[PDB]
Design a protein around this nucleic acid. Structure first.
Ligand SMILES: NCCSC[C@H]1O[C@@H](n2cnc3c(N)ncnc32)[C@H](O)[C@@H]1O
Length: 393
DNA sequence: GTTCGGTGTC
DNA sequence: GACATCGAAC
């Protein structure tokens, strides 16, 4: 893993430390952030680097190198500045997840970190650990994925940061070559409060920050790139979550173990549908992408709503809204399934057209950009629907 | 019950 | 770039 020079230079320009102050790089390896800070600001600081792998630790004689797990590390004194590129990844089984430690080690992480939620992430834990090691008024500058701005797993982290000091977020995007990650820079100071959102422009000279919006009373709410247009559209109709009960499909293991499900086609058997069967405005009932077949009438045994024709919205097609009416009522292995609430009048074909419209695609791309490769529930439930498509009596 | 990807594979 | 994970995780 190597952070591009223009990304490092941009983060160092945001970094601050008092003279003689303690500067720390977690997961430092050879320590590119300590070197860049020293070149820019001088030698009159106490430079420290923390690294877990003895093969990776290679710091110059002017920096103190510590062989330790940063997440379970207990230093004597706190730090004035913390900067760097933390490792990213979910801790779990090797067949599914990239971070592999003993169960007892993961238990030590869960115990240490109050923001740990769901599967969580290594970079979330690094963020909380760094804030806890900061002096009052201390500065943190990290480069992390943009996923923590919107996702539920990071709700406690967002609430934590809003409570501990003031936050600036700088959107970079996919700035790491051969790494599938949309990145942001977080500047945190352990004093004051509020959130500042920034866009960036890339030139040959580096990255230039452009102020987008300020949220002085930010309490840990989902972070979005709002405009005059997005606000206008949102108050034009009811939120989609107010009109529909939104459920997700049964998961692959539920189908695989179910006695009615077959691994091969046959008489009376029908394909279990995935996201590859869902298109803007229609459903492909013929193609099988899951490798699973079952009787259509037996679908209600996994989820009761599989027996009722309903609205299906896509989950893994990037940040966009792809919808279709499932007229036939098939078994689904993926996607959102929207069941109208009591007293809700709807026009299925008109609502599908609105959800697939270019106005809606632009709406979600403005707010959520490419933070995640999904349309999430929290994005979906906030989508505006006017009386022409769905009415609540 | 549903969430998430230094994505996974074409 | 297309076109989406899919199952271990809680
Ligand atoms: N800063 C570069 C990307 S993060 C990758 C580096 O962080 C180190 N690393 C991974 N987990 C760590 C941990 N828990 N504590 C300290 N260093 C870690 C790895 O050895 C690797 O050199």
């Amino acid at each position: 893993v190597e952070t591009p020079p223009e990304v490092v230079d941009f983060m160092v320009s945001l970094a601050e430390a008092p003279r003689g102050g303690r500067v720390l790089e977690p997961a430092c390896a050879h320590g590119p952030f300590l070197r860049a800070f020293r070149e820019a600001h001088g030698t009159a600081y106490r430079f420290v680097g923390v690294e877990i792998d003895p093969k990776a630790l290679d710091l110059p004689p002017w920096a103190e190198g510590i062989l330790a797990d940063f997440l379970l590390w207990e230093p004597g004194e706190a730090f004035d500045l913390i900067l760097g590129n933390p490792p990213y990844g979910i801790v779990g089984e090797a067949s599914k997840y990239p971070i592999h430690v003993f169960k007892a080690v993961k238990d030590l992480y869960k115990k240490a970190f109050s923001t740990w939620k769901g599967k969580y992430n290594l970079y979330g834990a690094f963020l909380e650990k760094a804030v806890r090691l900061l002096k009052p008024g201390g500065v943190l500058v990290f480069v992390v994925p943009a996923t923590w701005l919107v996702l539920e797993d990071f709700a406690l982290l967002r609430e934590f940061l809003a409570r501990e000091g003031k936050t600036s977020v700088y959107y970079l995007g996919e700035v790491f070559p051969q790494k599938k990650v949309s990145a942001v820079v977080i500047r945190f100071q352990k004093s004051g409060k509020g959130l500042s959102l920034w866009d960036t422009q890339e030139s040959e000279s580096g990255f230039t920050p452009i102020l987008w919006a300020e949220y002085p009373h930010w309490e840990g709410e989902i972070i979005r790139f709002e405009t005059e247009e997005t606000r206008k559209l949102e108050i034009s109709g009811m939120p989609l979550g107010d009109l529909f009960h939104i459920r997700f499909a049964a998961r692959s293991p539920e189908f695989k173990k179910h006695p009615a499900v077959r691994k091969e086609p046959g008489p009376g058997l029908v394909p279990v549908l995935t996201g590859r069967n869902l298109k803007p405005g229609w459903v492909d009932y013929e193609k099988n992408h899951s490798g699973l077949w079952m009787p259509k009438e037996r679908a209600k045994e996994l989820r009761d709503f599989y027996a009722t024709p309903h609205l299906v919205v896509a989950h893994t097609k990037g940040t966009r809204v792809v919808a279709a009416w499932d007229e036939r009522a098939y078994p689904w292995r993926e996607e959102f399934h929207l069941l109208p609430k009591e007293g809700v009048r709807l026009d299925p074909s008109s609502l599908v057209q609105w959800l697939n419209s270019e106005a809606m695609q632009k709406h979600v791309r403005t707010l959520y950009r490419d933070f995640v490769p999904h349309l999430t529930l929290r994005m979906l439930e906030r989508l505006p629907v006017r009386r022409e498509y769905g009415f609540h009596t």
